Write an enzyme that holds these catalytic residues in place. Structure first.
Site, PDB file in Angstrom:
ATOM      1  CG  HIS A 218      34.544  32.247  36.317  1.00  0.00           C
ATOM      2  ND1 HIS A 218      33.441  32.085  37.129  1.00  0.00           N
ATOM      3  CD2 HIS A 218      34.192  31.761  35.104  1.00  0.00           C
ATOM      4  CE1 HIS A 218      32.465  31.528  36.435  1.00  0.00           C
ATOM      5  NE2 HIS A 218      32.895  31.321  35.204  1.00  0.00           N
TER       6      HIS A 218
ATOM      7  CB  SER B 144      33.363  34.320  45.884  1.00  0.00           C
ATOM      8  OG  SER B 144      33.103  34.675  44.539  1.00  0.00           O
TER       9      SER B 144
ATOM     10  CE  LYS C  40      25.767  44.938  50.805  1.00  0.00           C
ATOM     11  NZ  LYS C  40      26.079  43.799  51.708  1.00  0.00           N
ATOM     12  CG  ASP C  41      28.290  44.328  43.743  1.00  0.00           C
ATOM     13  OD1 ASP C  41      28.177  43.923  44.919  1.00  0.00           O
ATOM     14  OD2 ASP C  41      29.186  43.931  42.970  1.00  0.00           O
TER      15      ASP C  41
ATOM     16  CD  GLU D 276      49.042  62.888  45.251  1.00  0.00           C
ATOM     17  OE1 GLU D 276      50.163  62.349  45.369  1.00  0.00           O
ATOM     18  OE2 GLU D 276      48.579  63.256  44.156  1.00  0.00           O
TER      19      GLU D 276
HETATM   20  C1  HEM Z   1      43.086  47.014  40.567  1.00  0.00           C
HETATM   21  C2  HEM Z   1      42.012  47.012  41.348  1.00  0.00           C
HETATM   22  C3  HEM Z   1      41.312  45.750  41.632  1.00  0.00           C
HETATM   23  C4  HEM Z   1      40.134  45.342  41.102  1.00  0.00           C
HETATM   24  C5  HEM Z   1      39.299  46.096  40.104  1.00  0.00           C
HETATM   25  C6  HEM Z   1      39.840  44.075  41.661  1.00  0.00           C
HETATM   26  C7  HEM Z   1      38.669  43.398  41.312  1.00  0.00           C
HETATM   27  C8  HEM Z   1      38.244  42.312  42.040  1.00  0.00           C
HETATM   28  C9  HEM Z   1      36.980  41.706  41.956  1.00  0.00           C
HETATM   29  C10 HEM Z   1      35.853  42.153  41.065  1.00  0.00           C
HETATM   30  C11 HEM Z   1      36.968  40.666  42.830  1.00  0.00           C
HETATM   31  C12 HEM Z   1      35.820  39.722  43.084  1.00  0.00           C
HETATM   32  C13 HEM Z   1      34.812  40.324  44.071  1.00  0.00           C
HETATM   33  C14 HEM Z   1      35.410  40.424  45.447  1.00  0.00           C
HETATM   34  O1  HEM Z   1      35.698  39.419  46.049  1.00  0.00           O
HETATM   35  O2  HEM Z   1      35.622  41.626  46.005  1.00  0.00           O
HETATM   36  C15 HEM Z   1      38.228  40.616  43.457  1.00  0.00           C
HETATM   37  C16 HEM Z   1      38.573  39.672  44.400  1.00  0.00           C
HETATM   38  C17 HEM Z   1      39.870  39.505  44.864  1.00  0.00           C
HETATM   39  N1  HEM Z   1      40.913  40.303  44.652  1.00  0.00           N
HETATM   40 FE1  HEM Z   1      40.865  41.981  43.562  1.00  0.00          FE
HETATM   41  N2  HEM Z   1      40.811  43.703  42.514  1.00  0.00           N
HETATM   42  C18 HEM Z   1      41.737  44.674  42.552  1.00  0.00           C
HETATM   43  C19 HEM Z   1      42.908  44.745  43.295  1.00  0.00           C
HETATM   44  C20 HEM Z   1      43.384  43.645  43.977  1.00  0.00           C
HETATM   45  C21 HEM Z   1      44.627  43.563  44.596  1.00  0.00           C
HETATM   46  C22 HEM Z   1      45.653  44.659  44.619  1.00  0.00           C
HETATM   47  C23 HEM Z   1      44.719  42.311  45.167  1.00  0.00           C
HETATM   48  C24 HEM Z   1      45.867  41.774  45.913  1.00  0.00           C
HETATM   49  C25 HEM Z   1      46.079  42.134  47.171  1.00  0.00           C
HETATM   50  C26 HEM Z   1      43.505  41.628  44.897  1.00  0.00           C
HETATM   51  C27 HEM Z   1      43.253  40.343  45.313  1.00  0.00           C
HETATM   52  C28 HEM Z   1      41.973  39.807  45.277  1.00  0.00           C
HETATM   53  C29 HEM Z   1      41.598  38.571  45.955  1.00  0.00           C
HETATM   54  C30 HEM Z   1      42.509  37.703  46.771  1.00  0.00           C
HETATM   55  C31 HEM Z   1      40.292  38.378  45.705  1.00  0.00           C
HETATM   56  C32 HEM Z   1      39.445  37.234  46.190  1.00  0.00           C
HETATM   57  C33 HEM Z   1      38.666  37.646  47.435  1.00  0.00           C
HETATM   58  C34 HEM Z   1      37.371  36.884  47.484  1.00  0.00           C
HETATM   59  O3  HEM Z   1      36.755  36.538  46.346  1.00  0.00           O
HETATM   60  O4  HEM Z   1      36.888  36.584  48.549  1.00  0.00           O
HETATM   61  N3  HEM Z   1      42.703  42.477  44.171  1.00  0.00           N
HETATM   62  N4  HEM Z   1      38.996  41.636  42.953  1.00  0.00           N
HETATM   63  C1  HEM Z   2      44.055  56.622  30.835  1.00  0.00           C
HETATM   64  C2  HEM Z   2      43.263  57.457  31.499  1.00  0.00           C
HETATM   65  C3  HEM Z   2      43.829  58.629  32.187  1.00  0.00           C
HETATM   66  C4  HEM Z   2      44.227  59.803  31.633  1.00  0.00           C
HETATM   67  C5  HEM Z   2      44.181  60.182  30.179  1.00  0.00           C
HETATM   68  C6  HEM Z   2      44.701  60.626  32.681  1.00  0.00           C
HETATM   69  C7  HEM Z   2      45.183  61.911  32.410  1.00  0.00           C
HETATM   70  C8  HEM Z   2      45.504  62.779  33.424  1.00  0.00           C
HETATM   71  C9  HEM Z   2      45.855  64.131  33.270  1.00  0.00           C
HETATM   72  C10 HEM Z   2      45.948  64.879  31.969  1.00  0.00           C
HETATM   73  C11 HEM Z   2      46.092  64.634  34.507  1.00  0.00           C
HETATM   74  C12 HEM Z   2      46.509  66.045  34.836  1.00  0.00           C
HETATM   75  C13 HEM Z   2      45.298  66.961  35.016  1.00  0.00           C
HETATM   76  C14 HEM Z   2      44.843  66.954  36.449  1.00  0.00           C
HETATM   77  O1  HEM Z   2      45.657  66.932  37.340  1.00  0.00           O
HETATM   78  O2  HEM Z   2      43.533  66.966  36.737  1.00  0.00           O
HETATM   79  C15 HEM Z   2      45.895  63.595  35.435  1.00  0.00           C
HETATM   80  C16 HEM Z   2      46.052  63.765  36.790  1.00  0.00           C
HETATM   81  C17 HEM Z   2      46.021  62.710  37.685  1.00  0.00           C
HETATM   82  N1  HEM Z   2      45.690  61.441  37.440  1.00  0.00           N
HETATM   83 FE1  HEM Z   2      45.146  60.716  35.648  1.00  0.00          FE
HETATM   84  N2  HEM Z   2      44.603  59.980  33.856  1.00  0.00           N
HETATM   85  C18 HEM Z   2      44.084  58.763  33.636  1.00  0.00           C
HETATM   86  C19 HEM Z   2      43.799  57.745  34.537  1.00  0.00           C
HETATM   87  C20 HEM Z   2      44.191  57.824  35.860  1.00  0.00           C
HETATM   88  C21 HEM Z   2      44.091  56.789  36.798  1.00  0.00           C
HETATM   89  C22 HEM Z   2      43.540  55.409  36.550  1.00  0.00           C
HETATM   90  C23 HEM Z   2      44.593  57.273  37.989  1.00  0.00           C
HETATM   91  C24 HEM Z   2      44.683  56.543  39.263  1.00  0.00           C
HETATM   92  C25 HEM Z   2      45.662  55.669  39.470  1.00  0.00           C
HETATM   93  C26 HEM Z   2      44.994  58.616  37.769  1.00  0.00           C
HETATM   94  C27 HEM Z   2      45.540  59.398  38.758  1.00  0.00           C
HETATM   95  C28 HEM Z   2      45.788  60.753  38.575  1.00  0.00           C
HETATM   96  C29 HEM Z   2      46.212  61.648  39.655  1.00  0.00           C
HETATM   97  C30 HEM Z   2      46.447  61.286  41.097  1.00  0.00           C
HETATM   98  C31 HEM Z   2      46.355  62.864  39.100  1.00  0.00           C
HETATM   99  C32 HEM Z   2      46.767  64.131  39.794  1.00  0.00           C
HETATM  100  C33 HEM Z   2      45.489  64.894  40.147  1.00  0.00           C
HETATM  101  C34 HEM Z   2      45.812  66.132  40.937  1.00  0.00           C
HETATM  102  O3  HEM Z   2      46.804  66.939  40.539  1.00  0.00           O
HETATM  103  O4  HEM Z   2      45.174  66.395  41.928  1.00  0.00           O
HETATM  104  N3  HEM Z   2      44.740  58.927  36.451  1.00  0.00           N
HETATM  105  N4  HEM Z   2      45.531  62.461  34.749  1.00  0.00           N
END
Ligand code: HEM
Ligand code: HEM
Ligand SMILES: CCCCCCCCCCCCCCCCCC(=O)OC[C@H](COP(=O)([O-])OCC(O)COP(=O)([O-])OC[C@@H](COC(=O)CCCCCCCCCCCCCCCCC)OC(=O)CCCCCCCCCCCCCCCCC)OC(=O)CCCCCCCCCCCCCCCCC
Ligand SMILES: CCCCCCCCCCCCCCCCCC(=O)OC[C@H](COP(=O)(O)OCCN)OC(=O)CCCCCCCCCCCCCCCCC
Ligand SMILES: CCCCCCCCCCCCCCCCCC(=O)OC[C@H](COP(=O)(O)OCCN)OC(=O)CCCCCCCCCCCCCCCCC
Ligand SMILES: CCCCCCCCCCCCCCCCCC(=O)OC[C@H](COP(=O)(O)OCCN)OC(=O)CCCCCCCCCCCCCCCCC
Ligand code: HEC
Lengths: 380, 241, 67, 55, 67, 31, 101, 48, 31
Positions: free
Chosen positions: A200, A204, A226-227, A270
């Site tokens: 912030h 951007s 847009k979003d 996966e």
């Molecule tokens: C965990 C999932 C993530 C969320 C929810 C997230 C969320 C956001 C949001 C809301 C923005 C501002 C809007 C935009 O520019 O797209 C942003 C920008 C950005 N994010 Fe993330 N982000 C995530 C993962 C990452 C990761 C893994 C990286 C590192 C590679 C990253 C690096 C950046 C950078 C460098 C920007 C600035 C780009 C720009 O404003 O032009 N983000 N992210």
């Molecule tokens: C805190 C919130 C969450 C809870 C309580 C939760 C709980 C669970 C449970 C009980 C399962 C096994 C049941 C199933 O396979 O459908 C599962 C599967 C899975 N979850 Fe989550 N989860 C959460 C958030 C997430 C998030 C954020 C991700 C992504 C990174 C994720 C990725 C997965 C994946 C890849 C599987 C395997 C699905 C499959 O077998 O095809 N979960 N989760």
């Protein structure tokens, strides 16, 4: 006098979501991270439903998964949104990181560091949540990763003791997996809040990489609608994956119950881990393999120190554009090799592709950058 | 000889994006499972209350609960209380444990078939090819006793004999029970075992498709309006020279 | 802090913008120009990935051939 | 040279709410119960986590 | 008895050129490994080739005969 | 005043495209 | 030097920033040294630079380019920010030499 | 719960093996007897 | 150099208050 600038809640909402100046030329790629945010919300909603009818008791855990698919009304639907939303989460995450590598967004150093911390956290949550439904594939991947963690000297022993919790498969392992998979997405949301807060104060980035203070527009109502359009398109694609082809991304072998005495003919996670598994199929060393995976992820964090060019974006850099597109190409080569058996000639393709990936990240972009620097008369 | 043949693509009645299951063939393949195919294999995840509204009505499917004589078990008095079945009971297991199943059916386990479409490659096409593609063993290969040649099975040595042949069953709706019809019916029902969700999933599928096609041009026109205020902007630079 | 009012010192710039309520032969050559400009940077990576995929599948099924 | 505590994007929130927040000098112990309420809520959630993740 | 609408189908398109050369080379592998005794050579790969061609042929034209 | 008509229209075109295999088409046979 | 001249002209044409009416020095990443060299510019060059940047921004908003007649040609590309930039690196390197000693 | 409190390990094993406790089924499918162990609970006189 | 002495002293006053009552005091005649 107006409530938007004297009430503190509305002042926070106006300052962070309405009157925030944004560049007027950002493409649809800038929607993607916002999509990732609401993607998180979707999983949390399904996570709440998976707190309802899931038990951490191995045979009845698989039975409870089948009861969620059958007995609970719209429970199969929630399970399929959870799986296909993890898939869509990693699609949006990969395109977000690709936007960051392409359009020179890695110059924001602390936002990049919060991002790579988020990326480690979300890979950990995805693998750990893959362990929870307790199939044969989840079993064998869990055993492989825990033995690889136990291969390190005098550190992995207490981690296996805390994680497995006993001599063999017991309920404590699945309870602690479910606890960590419950807890760490909320830490991911907290680091997303910190991610936005660090974004912030600097504004951007535009795709041109220039200073966009000359032409800036309010976030509302342009990027709001847009979003909204991006959210509707992402919902359409996710529900098309859920309601029409529910298992085209999922591994079919996960759906039969786990048997430790048998060995499956092709271990496979996966797709979004597969390229990392390609690195595990690259070099024949345990601790060298862990160092290879950790450095292959951490090299994104070391990437902002390798920027040798005097211009930010790759939009005006054709040679580095070619290098970036062959980088995406051989990353796709790794994620195809990872879903292949270890036979000729997949081993040489995987090894040369991993070597080419490390070279195309680390050593060759500085040379391309100084070539770009020299071809425009700025390099000594 | 580890090379394998992938099953061919069959023109199923549910191959399409909005194509449902033949519920008459679902109940036909269910009858096929009941009278021959339940002798070795098991359905541990399918209950009798899932058959209402799919295969039969409320009553007669309940009648099947009395035809199998399931047993629940213990109570206070300690004897082994006989009771007729009801709709809330699962399908009966043939063996009390896997190693009694292996010992009584030649070392090989006849595994759970509730998820046998979803857990193997190909799907219902592989089941149809494995059930229909029973041929003589070629030269060179020397299988032992009780093992039969089938090229779709990995290892080409399936632990079961061909169970289906001419006039092995008859149906209540009057269908000639040939080998292809009985294999197609059991493949369709055994596809429904992994997916009892198919019709409602496709219902929500076209509901989602119509809703998305209705609500996407509205947001598209709104975005085009709120950005066509910007795209009509022309800029001019007038320096003092 | 970074609100409108202290962004940049833009001087002598005139902007004209019509009302949104007062307003494919042009967009098709535009997207054709865009894909013509970016095709030589995008396509040959995916082309060589397709060739490596087909060649690897052919050599795998040739290695499975016992001659 | 700049002050880290007043220019950091994350630490100015925590010091404006916690460190250099001006409070009345003559506050008795009763207001401290409010702070106790907050940490009491926290330990409830902690015990609540321990009432679900193993159980 | 009830004659199959399968044995009227998989022998219906046995007259194709690929099918008859597959059966000819199946007879070729059969008599060349009946000629030799102490080898461990197996005739399996063009058995899968013949089964692949015949399975595609029967999957083309099966399902309209069945009810 | 629109969503219930939308639901029944989607359902009606679903039984129009899928005829002779759903459970609702053989209500006359057994009840 | 005909090998280098034609390749430089082709690389200037294929770089793409001449199609949106930019000079070379507008494309540079704005670090603190580049921002200091921008701060030392005269007012007319500064106003020209910000108008060219704004024109670039709302040209790439529409995903369009300038007409071919008014692209930035290679011979009229002026390195206006280059001597101020060289002066800024000279003072910064002198300051780091004095801090090292 | 009585080991290290009132009885030793062998004393608790003797008290458990004094108690006959219901189990089953076996490979044939009868719901039979066994002498007790530590994980068995206390015997109910009348569960209903 | 205090934590082991802390736990040892707390335990020592615990069996000094409850001498002859805990299980470790009666692991002689019941073993
Ligand atoms: C965990 C999932 C993530 C969320 C929810 C997230 C969320 C956001 C949001 C809301 C923005 C501002 C809007 C935009 O520019 O797209 C942003 C920008 C950005 N994010 Fe993330 N982000 C995530 C993962 C990452 C990761 C893994 C990286 C590192 C590679 C990253 C690096 C950046 C950078 C460098 C920007 C600035 C780009 C720009 O404003 O032009 N983000 N992210
Ligand atoms: C805190 C919130 C969450 C809870 C309580 C939760 C709980 C669970 C449970 C009980 C399962 C096994 C049941 C199933 O396979 O459908 C599962 C599967 C899975 N979850 Fe989550 N989860 C959460 C958030 C997430 C998030 C954020 C991700 C992504 C990174 C994720 C990725 C997965 C994946 C890849 C599987 C395997 C699905 C499959 O077998 O095809 N979960 N989760
Ligand atoms: C093809 C023939 C027509 C043609 O050439 O149209 C060009 C035209 C673009 O021409 P343009 O004038 O350069 O674009 C500016 C327009 O004013 C506005 O067009 P645009 O290109 O800026 O569109 C914004 C973009 C916005 O897209 C996003 O925001 C994408 C969000 C994420 C997508 C999904 C991510 C996950 C994917 C997982 C796999 O929209 C789309 O990508 C399609 C939206 C369709 C909405 C429903 C229309 C009925 O393309 C479209 O309008 C696309 C839709 C129609 C085809
Ligand atoms: C596919 C996208 C094809 C495409 O449109 O490419 C062109 C576009 C860049 O266009 P641009 O240079 O801005 O030119 C605009 C024209 N005046 O290209 C882009 O916008 C590409 C931006 C990046 C998107 C691709 C990301 C690929 C996935 C990477 C995942 C792995 C990241 C590292 C993980 C470790
Ligand atoms: C001289 C006449 C032909 C060229 C000018 C006509 C217009 C061509 C289409 C417009 C796009 C364009 O200019 O593409 C040039 C592009 C970048 O070329 P560049 O990176 O400078 O050098 C070649 C490899 N380094 O070139 C390429 O991307 C080609 C090299 C691709 C290498 C893939 C590996
Ligand atoms: C790297 C080592 C040096 C390579 C030098 C040759 C590069 C290719 C080349 O010459 O591209 C420029 C192209 C044709 O060059 P041209 O000016 O017609 O002929 C004089 C020869 N330099 O000219 C063009 O494409 C003209 C572009 C603008 C119109
Ligand atoms: C007892 C003689 C059985 C009858 C009746 C049926 N099946 Fe069978 N089947 C049986 C065994 C012992 C095995 C294991 C084979 C091995 O080598 O371990 C099987 C296997 C299958 C399979 C394949 C499962 C696999 O692991 O690949 C399928 C698809 C299958 N059985 C289907 C099937 C059907 C549809 C039946 C009713 C006609 C049927 N089986 C009956 C033993 C027996």
């Amino acid at each position: 006098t107006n409530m938007r600038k004297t009430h503190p809640l509305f002042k926070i909402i106006n300052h962070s979501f309405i009157d925030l100046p944004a560049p007027s030329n950002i493409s649809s790629w800038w929607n993607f991270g916002s999509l990732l945010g609401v993607c998180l919300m979707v999983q949390i909603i399904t996570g709440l439903f998976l707190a309802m009818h899931y038990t951490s008791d191995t045979m009845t855990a698989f039975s409870s998964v089948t009861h969620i698919c059958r007995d609970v009304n719209y429970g199969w639907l929630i399970r399929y949104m959870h799986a296909n939303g993890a898939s869509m989460f990693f699609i949006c995450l990969f395109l977000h990181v690709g936007r960051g590598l392409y359009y020179g967004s890695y110059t924001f150093m602390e936002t990049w560091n919060i991002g790579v911390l988020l990326l480690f956290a979300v890979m950990a949550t995805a693998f750990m949540g893959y362990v929870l439904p307790w199939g044969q594939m989840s079993f064998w991947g869990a055993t492989v990763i825990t033995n690889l963690l136990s291969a390190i000297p005098y550190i992995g022993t207490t981690l296996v003791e805390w994680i497995w919790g006993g001599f063999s498969v017991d309920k404590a392992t699945l309870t602690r997996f479910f606890a960590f998979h419950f807890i760490l997405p909320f830490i991911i949301a907290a680091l997303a809040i910190v991610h936005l807060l660090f974004l912030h104060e600097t504004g951007s980035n535009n795709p041109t990489g220039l200073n966009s203070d000359a032409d800036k527009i309010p976030f509302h109502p342009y990027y709001t609608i847009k979003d909204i359009l991006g959210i509707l398109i992402m919902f359409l694609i996710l529900m098309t994956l859920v309601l029409f082809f529910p298992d085209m991304l999922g591994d079919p072998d996960n759906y039969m119950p786990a048997n430790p005495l048998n060995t499956p003919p092709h271990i496979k996670p996966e797709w979004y881990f597969l390229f990392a598994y390609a690195i595990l199929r690259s070099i024949p060393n345990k601790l060298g393999g862990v160092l290879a995976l950790i450095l292959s992820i951490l090299i994104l964090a070391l990437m902002p120190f390798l920027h040798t060019s005097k211009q930010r974006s790759l939009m005006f850099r054709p040679i580095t554009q070619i290098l970036y597109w062959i980088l995406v190409a051989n990353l796709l080569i790794l994620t195809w090799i990872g879903g292949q058996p270890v036979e000729h000639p997949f081993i040489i393709i995987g090894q040369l592709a991993s070597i080419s990936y490390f070279s195309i990240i680390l050593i060759l972009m500085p040379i391309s950058g100084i070539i770009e620097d020299k071809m425009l008369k700025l390099y000594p | 000889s580890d090379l394998e043949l992938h099953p061919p693509s069959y023109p199923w009645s549910h191959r399409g994006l909005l194509s449902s299951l033949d519920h008459t063939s679902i109940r036909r393949g269910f009858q096929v499972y009941k009278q021959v195919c339940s002798s070795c294999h098991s359905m541990d995840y399918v209950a009798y209350r899932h058959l209402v509204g799919v295969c039969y009505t409320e009553e007669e499917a309940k009648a099947l609960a009395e035809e199998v004589e399931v047993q629940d078990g213990p109570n206070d008095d300690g004897e082994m209380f006989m009771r007729p079945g009801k709709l809330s009971d699962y399908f009966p297991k043939p063996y009390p444990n896997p190693e009694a199943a292996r010992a009584a059916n030649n070392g090989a386990l006849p595994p759970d078939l509730s998820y046998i479409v979803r857990a193997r490659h190909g799907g219902e096409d592989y089941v149809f090819s494995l059930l229909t593609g029973y041929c003589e063993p070629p030269t060179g290969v020397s299988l032992r006793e009780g093992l039969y040649f089938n090229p779709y099975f990995p290892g080409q040595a399936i632990g079961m004999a061909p169970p289906i042949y001419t006039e092995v069953l008859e149906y209540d709706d009057g269908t000639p029970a040939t080998m292809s019809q009985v294999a197609k019916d059991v493949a369709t029902f055994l596809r429904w075992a992994s997916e009892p969700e198919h019709d409602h999933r496709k219902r929500m599928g076209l509901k989602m498709l119509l809703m998305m096609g209705l609500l996407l041009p509205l947001t598209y026109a709104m975005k085009r309006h709120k950005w066509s205020v910007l795209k009509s902007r022309k800029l001019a630079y007038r320096p003092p020279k | 802090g970074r609100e409108f009012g202290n962004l940049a010192r833009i001087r002598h710039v005139i902007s004209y913008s019509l009302s949104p309520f007062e307003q494919f032969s042009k967009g098709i050559p535009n997207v054709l120009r865009r894909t013509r400009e970016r095709i030589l940077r995008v396509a040959p990576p995916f082309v060589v990935v397709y060739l490596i995929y087909t060649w690897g599948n052919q050599e795998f099924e040739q290695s499975k051939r016992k001659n | 040279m700049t002050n880290m505590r007043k220019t950091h994007p994350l630490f100015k929130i925590i010091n404006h709410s916690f460190i250099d927040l001006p409070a009345p000098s003559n506050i008795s112990s009763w207001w401290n119960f409010g702070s106790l309420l907050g940490v009491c809520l926290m330990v409830q959630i902690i015990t609540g986590l321990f009432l679900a993740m193993h159980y | 008895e009830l004659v199959d609408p399968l044995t009227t189908v998989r022998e219906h398109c046995e007259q194709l050129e690929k099918c008859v050369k597959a059966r000819e080379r199946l007879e070729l592998c059969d008599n060349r490994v009946s000629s030799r005794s102490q080898t461990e050579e197996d005739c399996t790969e063009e058995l899968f080739d013949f089964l692949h061609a015949r399975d595609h042929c029967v999957a083309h034209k099966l399902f309209k005969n069945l009810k | 005043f629109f969503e219930r008509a939308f639901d029944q229209g989607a359902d009606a075109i679903y039984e129009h495209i899928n005829e002779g295999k759903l459970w609702k088409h053989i209500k006359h046979k057994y009840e | 030097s005909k090998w280098l001249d034609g390749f430089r002209k082709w690389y200037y044409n294929a770089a793409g920033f001449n199609k949106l009416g930019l000079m070379r020095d507008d494309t540079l990443h704005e670090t603190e040294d580049v921002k200091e060299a921008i701060r030392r510019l005269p007012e007319d060059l500064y106003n020209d630079r910000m108008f060219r940047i704004k024109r670039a921004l709302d040209l790439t908003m529409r995903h369009q380019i300038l007409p071919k007649d008014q692209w930035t040609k290679y011979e009229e590309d002026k390195f206006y920010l280059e001597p101020y930039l060289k002066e800024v690196i000279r003072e910064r390197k002198e300051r780091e030499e004095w801090a090292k000693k």
